[PDB]
């Protein structure tokens, strides 16, 4: 009963395996001057100081991050009756786009169950509400691009 986090280089893995993943993220690095300049500035600072450049909000240490993660995991939020129609409306919208794209996307009935799974995870961070479904939807469509 474990979660699977896989990393692969595009060539050809079987489709029967790729459709099982809730999120399939294609990380593509297209060269662009300003972004490449910003990335280089970040990396040089890390080599220069052995830590990330300062930001407005300070990152939390691992010791402290593992406490919140465990604390959140105790909750068991549930999805109400009311959201049933709204989640359904999102599913058909995703399906329509997949058929229109004509790409090798894996939007199927399995996708509907994935919306619920992510939505409850988002709530466990925060009873599920419409804002968790919106974040779950946004995260997934951004994945299929």
């Amino acid at each position: 009963r474990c979660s699977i986090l896989a990393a692969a280089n595009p060539a050809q893995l079987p489709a029967a395996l790729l459709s099982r993943f809730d999120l399939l993220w294609l990380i593509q690095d297209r060269p662009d001057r300003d972004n490449d300049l910003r990335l280089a500035q970040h990396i040089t600072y890390v080599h220069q100081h052995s830590r990330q450049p300062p930001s407005q909000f300070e990152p939390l240490d691992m010791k402290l991050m593992r406490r919140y993660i465990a604390m959140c995991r105790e909750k068991q939020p549930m999805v109400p009756e009311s959201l049933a129609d709204y989640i359904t409306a999102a599913y058909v919208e995703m399906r329509r786009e997949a058929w229109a794209s004509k790409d090798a996307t894996y939007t199927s009935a399995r996708t509907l169950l994935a919306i619920l799974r992510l939505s409850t995870a988002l709530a466990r961070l925060r009873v599920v509400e419409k804002e968790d479904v919106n974040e779950a939807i946004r995260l997934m469509e951004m994945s299929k691009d």
Binding site: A15, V92, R95, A104
Partner: protein, 607 residues
């Protein structure tokens, strides 16, 4: 002995327990009466009852089972012989309803105490004989003697009594008296396992009537005595290791998972006008809108008539796009059938289809007189394809390996699931070229069904509502569905038991005319049918007759068989270019239009 056990007091207390205890006529008095009626000399006693009546007797039973249980046997025997003036005397088997310990928490303080543990059986040994009484014969005068075993040690005689010769008594092994013993390996239950640790295992020893009472795969609560035994350093020396090994002496097993009224209910169902559709609906309530596939699977479950001159078995292949409900259907059929096997065509698979010193027959042989569900049909290698063709054509599996030459009966119905070679079904491609399997193998299936994924929005919305409703289904509905499934299983069992349909004259004429018409369709313009299909119809017709619980095949059965066959062909025999009537794709693997185009290409290149 360091025990506060007075035998007489314990026996009296237990006799009092049998006399007076009442389950909230004494319960165990009724049990003794039932023992007399049945004749099985075993009385099971719930330790919770003994605790409730008497807390001292319970405490002594748990602490000193070896000493106390025989006194219980004496008490029960005395009482029973009073109330009813049997191969053996009755034996008490105290047990705990629920486990009192976890396999991981067994401790030295529990040695020689009565405990209950839960687990799953993985291995059982063959029977081990234990000597109880040794038999000696003088090698000079043939005088015979018998010696009782004493704590695993035997007092060999030194001088013959009759002739006084010394060292003349030889042990005759096969004139002695032996009792049965069995070694069982119990695996820790998945629920009680801590996260990420490998399961623990325990050794159990069963004796006499408790041997062969469990089989590998069983989930059982075992009540027995915890034992510690020394380990010899090597077989030759009498030195022992300071760390003891442990096992459990089994005392009680508890396996933790027709009637005339039942037959009357089944017949009442069989009288209903729409029994076919009722059973089809009950077959797989979770799957949505696949009515014809469900009807075909029901007919496969019932099967045709075993003529004993003719395969009576119905083979069904479900090919389709990924993300449909094919695996769920296969799982539901596997659960339903009594002698079924669920397996995969991939070679790496844990359970294999092929037979492979112990002779290991594959799933196809194991599913003899049953259904074999094969999930990744398209992923079979060439050897597995040959094996499957042999099974489907001849219903036997031949092996010639490691000096063993034999033929194994495999009369099994194949329910197969197949995916396309591409990421999606290609409408331009026919069935043969969509799934890379030989046409010779495809021609052995009675029915091929296509589970395509629609582009319709309304279908998506309806399926979404179906799945959400299932996601919120209530416990009473689940229980009702389970009851309906049990009714279906009983109906199928009864039909297999007692119904053997036979072709009536009207059915024969209907079948002949049906075949002639199917041929005529092609003959009008190619060939639109071949004789093998006629056989399929017969099988299907018989299956339908069995669903009604009828011993005669009627014209209605033939009409239903024709409709189902014609629907399956319309699903899977369609040429994407022109039409459907062409069945040459199944017989030859190449579309007639494709054949003409290839002929044109070859002739042009020959120009």
């Amino acid at each position: 002995w360091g025990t506060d056990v007075n035998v007489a007091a314990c026996k009296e207390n237990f006799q009092r327990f049998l006399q007076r205890f009442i389950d909230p006529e004494p319960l165990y008095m009724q049990r003794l009466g039932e023992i007399n009626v049945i004749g099985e000399p075993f009385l099971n006693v719930n330790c919770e009852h003994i605790k409730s009546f008497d807390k001292n007797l319970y405490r002594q039973l748990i602490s000193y089972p070896q000493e106390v249980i025989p006194t219980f046997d004496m008490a029960v025997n005395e009482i029973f012989f009073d109330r009813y003036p049997l191969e053996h005397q009755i034996q008490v088997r105290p047990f705990n309803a629920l486990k009192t310990k976890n396999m991981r928490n067994l401790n030295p303080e529990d040695i020689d105490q009565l405990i209950t543990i839960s687990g799953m059986v993985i291995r059982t040994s063959q029977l081990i004989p234990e000597m109880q009484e040794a038999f000696f014969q003088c090698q000079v005068c043939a005088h015979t003697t018998r010696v009782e075993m004493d704590r695993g040690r035997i007092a060999e005689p030194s001088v013959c009594g009759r002739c006084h010769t010394t060292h003349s008594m030889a042990l005759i092994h096969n004139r002695s008296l032996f009792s049965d013993k069995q070694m069982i390996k119990l695996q820790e239950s998945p629920e009680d396992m801590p996260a990420g640790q490998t399961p623990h295992t325990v050794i159990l020893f069963a004796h006499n009537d408790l041997v062969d009472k469990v089989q590998p795969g069983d989930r059982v609560n075992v009540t027995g005595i915890y034992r510690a035994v020394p380990i010899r350093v090597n077989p030759r020396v009498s030195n022992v290791k300071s760390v003891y090994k442990t096992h459990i002496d089994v005392i009680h097993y508890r396996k933790t998972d027709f009637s005339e009224k039942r037959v009357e209910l089944l017949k009442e169902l069989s009288r209903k006008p729409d029994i076919y559709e009722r059973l089809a609906s009950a077959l797989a309530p979770s799957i949505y809108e696949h009515e014809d596939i469900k009807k075909g699977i029901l007919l496969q479950l019932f099967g045709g008539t075993r003529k004993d001159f003719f395969r009576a078995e119905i083979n069904i292949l479900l090919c389709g796009d990924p993300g449909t409900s094919k695996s769920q259907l296969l799982q539901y059929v596997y659960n339903l059938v009594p002698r079924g096997q669920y397996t995969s065509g991939k070679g790496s698979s844990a359970v294999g289809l092929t037979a492979y010193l112990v002779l290991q027959t594959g799933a196809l042989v194991l599913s003899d007189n049953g259904i074999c569900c094969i999930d990744e049909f398209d992923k079979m290698n060439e050897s597995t394809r040959s094996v499957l063709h042999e099974v489907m054509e001849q219903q036997t599996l031949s092996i010639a390996k490691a000096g063993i030459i034999c033929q194994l009966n495999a009369r099994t119905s194949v329910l197969a699931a197949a995916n396309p070679i591409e990421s999606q079904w290609n409408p331009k491609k026919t069935t043969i070229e969509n799934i890379q399997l030989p046409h010779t193998l495809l021609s052995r299936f009675d029915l091929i069904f296509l589970l395509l994924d629609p582009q319709d929005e309304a279908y998506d919305r309806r399926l979404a509502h179906h799945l959400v409703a299932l996601y919120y289904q209530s416990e009473e509905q689940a229980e009702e569905e389970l009851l309906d499934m049990a009714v279906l299983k009983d109906y199928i069992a009864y039909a297999h038991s007692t119904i053997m349909p036979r072709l009536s004259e009207e059915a024969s004429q209907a079948l002949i005319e049906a075949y002639v018409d199917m041929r005529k369709i092609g003959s009008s313009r190619m060939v639109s049918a071949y004789p093998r299909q006629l056989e399929s119809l017969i099988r299907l017709a018989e299956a339908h007759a069995k669903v009604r619980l009828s011993n005669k095949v009627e014209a209605i059965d033939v009409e239903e068989a024709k409709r189902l066959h014609r629907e399956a062909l319309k699903q899977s025999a369609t040429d994407p270019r022109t039409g459907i009537v062409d069945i040459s794709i199944l017989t030859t693997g190449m579309s007639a239009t494709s054949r003409k185009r290839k002929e044109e290409l070859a002739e042009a290149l020959k120009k």
